[PDB]
């Protein structure tokens, strides 16, 4: 629940034209699942 | 290939100081991605 809520909130922050302070935090969260996209992480 | 490459392009675009042209389409792509990962369909 923590993961999903922080994800959706941070996405909503972009939705109104607001610019985040730590783009690495969201970039890591978007890269975290593209590796599941092709399957094996490890 | 096309949607994957444009997704990577735009994510690097956002996390580089530039500003996207249409955040609504962006948010739509992430929303559909998380929905399909949740396996909702229909």
């Amino acid at each position: 629940v923590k993961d999903l809520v922080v994800l959706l909130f941070e996405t909503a922050l972009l939705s109104s034209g607001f610019s985040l302070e730590d783009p690495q935090t969201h970039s890591n969260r978007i890269y975290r699942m593209i590796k599941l996209g092709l399957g094996i992480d490890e | 290939v096309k949607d994957l490459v444009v997704l990577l392009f735009e994510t690097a675009l956002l996390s580089s100081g530039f500003s996207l042209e249409d955040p609504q389409t962006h948010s739509n792509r992430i929303y559909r991605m998380i929905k399909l990962g949740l396996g909702i369909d229909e």
Binding site: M33, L36 | G37, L38, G39
Partner: protein
């Protein structure tokens, strides 16, 4: 060799305890399997059956030991394959069961309950993978 007495005793214990499991008399079936195995330790079907009964009582280690001993008896006991794949599914280490059912459907695709179980487990494992 072997004498007919031990084979007959194992067969009759198997039939009795199957009748009892049809009535869901689990502990009696377990003791008759135990006696028959003490008389004939080379029967893999007893391993699989007690494995399944232990799954219904949720004692996984004993069941996996029975499955390992049965496979060491006969590597290609398909009933044992189904049983210990379901055991692992009921435990949580999904990948081995996934590989088991994938191999089974590759060799035997015309099974309906197995295919629905496989697909529902596949959605299960996808959700488990994504949720982190």
């Amino acid at each position: 060799p072997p004498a007919d007495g031990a084979l007959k005793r194992a067969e009759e214990l198997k039939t009795q305890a199957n009748d009892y499991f049809k009535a869901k008399d689990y502990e009696n079936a377990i003791k008759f399997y135990s006696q028959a195995i003490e008389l004939n330790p080379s029967n893999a079907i007893y391993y699989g059956n007690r494995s399944l009964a232990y799954l219904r009582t949720e004692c996984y280690g004993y069941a996996l030991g029975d499955a390992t001993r049965a496979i060491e008896l006969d590597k290609k006991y398909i009933k044992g394959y189904y049983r210990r794949a379901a055991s692992n599914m009921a435990l949580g280490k999904f990948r081995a069961a996934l590989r088991d059912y994938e191999t089974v459907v590759k060799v035997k695709p015309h099974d309906k309950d197995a295919k629905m179980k496989y697909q529902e487990c596949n959605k299960i494992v996808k959700q488990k993978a994504f949720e982190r």
